[PDB]
Amino acid sequence: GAEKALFRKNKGRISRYLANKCSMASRIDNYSEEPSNVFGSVLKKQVEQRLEFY
Amino acid sequence: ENPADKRRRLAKQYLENLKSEADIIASRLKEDVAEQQGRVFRYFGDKLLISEAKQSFTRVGENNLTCISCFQPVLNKYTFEESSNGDKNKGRLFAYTVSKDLQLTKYDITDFSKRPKKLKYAKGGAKYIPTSKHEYENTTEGHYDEILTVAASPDGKYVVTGGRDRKLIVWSTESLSPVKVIPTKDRRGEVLSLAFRKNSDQLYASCADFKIRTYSINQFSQLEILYGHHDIVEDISALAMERCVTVGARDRTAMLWKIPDETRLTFRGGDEPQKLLRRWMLFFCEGSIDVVSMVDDFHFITGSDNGNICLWSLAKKKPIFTERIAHGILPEPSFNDISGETDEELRKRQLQGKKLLQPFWITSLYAIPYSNVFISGSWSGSLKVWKISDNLRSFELLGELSGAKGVVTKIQVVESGKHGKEKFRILASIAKEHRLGRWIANVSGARNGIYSAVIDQTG
Amino acid sequence: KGKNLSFK
Amino acid sequence: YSTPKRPYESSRLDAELKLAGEFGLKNKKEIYRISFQLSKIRRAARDLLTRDEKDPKRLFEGNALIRRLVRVGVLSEDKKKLDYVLALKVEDFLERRLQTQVYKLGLAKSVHHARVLITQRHIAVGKQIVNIPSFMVRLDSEKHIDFAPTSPFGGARPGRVARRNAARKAE
Amino acid sequence: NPKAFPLADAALTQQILDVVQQAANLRQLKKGANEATKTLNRGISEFIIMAADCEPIEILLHLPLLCEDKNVPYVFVPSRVALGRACGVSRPVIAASITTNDASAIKTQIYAVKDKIETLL
């Protein structure tokens, strides 16, 4: 997503951090027959805490 | 006023005290030197009252309290002088603690009815980082990396600390002023456990470079390096003799070192479930031996990462008795967190029934010298007190203390009172994370503090 | 059994 | 050692070239020595196989030989039979040398660097400094290879060149 | 049936982890799912070890699809906290990879365990 800046120095760090979590979210969606949104929310709140920290 | 007279005066006075307390006089005098004969002579397991123990938890600011060492003065029969360093320190009990925050703290625990009361502290930091980067130049006064262990000298004059900085700093007990710094002089020589030879100034240090280093604190000099473990030497123990024992962690081997004879005895668990299940006709294989404490000059106990508390004898290479899953099994992972699938039954399957369950590790294990009682620690939330049988062929669960919550990094026991009636105080360091690393998932309700428990004997 | 010492 | 039957076969010359190249051997005498030991071991194993199974001498000597080879490390624990002793090669012995082990453990960046380290008294097996590249490391001694306490790479003071350069720089 | 499959027994898991700790000392161990994904892509992986108690497991289930397609053995160990301790790092590790090197000092042990995983699969 670096051609359309989908995820966008401290600005870059959050972009990279969001990329890892985004990759984690896709794995849960793809290999679950009936994916739920419970893990996606906690994943997002984890990014929010990182967002506040920087 | 000849010196022979002085000993005679003290000797006569000491007998006068024993007569006042009271065959019996003859019996006690043998017990005074029973320590020299390396055999268990303190059979007070039955007399303990675990249920009535007064338990308390004292919080501490330092994060991840890593180790605790207790100093108890002992009246020396040879000279009838107390082990206390100076006149001011008569009958005073001290406890020293170290934490991953690079802080060493001393406490006073003389009053069993009262909580530990901080006296003095010294803290390190980045100020002490060595610029030279050569191992022999790692001689800075303060610590700059996690302190992992601490021990208080039997003479009460020094307390020595070491950690991942690959240094062995010895402090003055009165002021916590560093007086000497001994580099381990190895790239990976991280100190992991310290033990003094009882009633002596010799120190044995276990390093992560697979070697045990020995020191003489009075001369501030290294003596010997011992070799032979197949993995890191995580823990070490010692008693009146020079027979220190060690456990090599993943190598799954406990070694006793006869320093004079320059020989070692190798002990290996060698237990396999298929036979244990066949003999029965959940068993987990041991992964490491992490803790050790010598009950006796001819016996010691070890605690592994599969919840096994083993009793050993010098004569036999295999364990004489084993207590599998001593602390129980860990709680199952939650089914709402195991999988992201919506249907509950789908998530329950990912638990795979009971195959994912694992046992508690024996994070701490301490045995009172020359006694039939030892204490085992983990993060199950309770300290278990055990009793070794009279024949020293098996042990049973005496009782439990539920006050401690968190990872029990280290246990200690200190005693007070006359010979007949004696109160034992159990001090255990509690931390939110394991001393070596941060592997363990956070335990609900865990807190950084010094767990304390006073137990009284009656009969 | 022998005896043990360290000096200097 | 004992000289080979026809030293000048081209295939033999290329085999010696490859062995010396991979294990950094100084001359062919080392290869001949290892081949001589291997030949003795395999001849003994052959004569043991010739005898009938359950023969007391076969049982005793074969068990002793396989135990020896397992201790030295050449023979795997799951191949404890004389037939697999017949299947040994010179490479198996060459790998057990201290030079190759020092190279493999990561202490040296190349076999020749390992040899230079060994003959300069930098490598210790347990407590004892070893300066003999042809030292054969057993299983237990496989791990105990480390830099010696006296070595400047082992935690002693820097070598003569290092402290001399420091002295000139300070002046 | 379960997504985390096959799961090594107690006897095998100690053997696997013992290989893991030696690979760590010899700089032949890659730690973490992201690293293990790269090694499979480059074709330098001997076999993959995975944690069956990962929360959730699904964040490491892309490896079996990669592992099988390249015909690389894979196995699940019950504990991630224990696996992290073996790896030599101070945090739990859910997935690890053993890099390929025929000149490694621990070649025989890696091949011994690799055979067991193949039979176990």
Place this chain on the structure above:
Amino acid sequence: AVTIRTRKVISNPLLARKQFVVDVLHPNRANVSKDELREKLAEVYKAEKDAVSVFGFRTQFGGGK
């Protein structure tokens, strides 16, 4: 620091002495002069220096003992 350990102690009253094997561990030091060893053994066994005799000393290869 340097350590002296005695082993294989045999009391020989016929010659009126005690004979033993002496092991000297001397990290970071060439070796121990026989006179110094005599002084240390003498005080350890509580006898005059004149009554102590040591011989047959070989430093182990690599040093330190």
Place this chain on the structure above:
RNA sequence: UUGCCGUUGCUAUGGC
């Protein structure tokens, strides 16, 4: 009794 923040007392324990 705590580095910070609470609750509970005139002391004890919840979170980071």
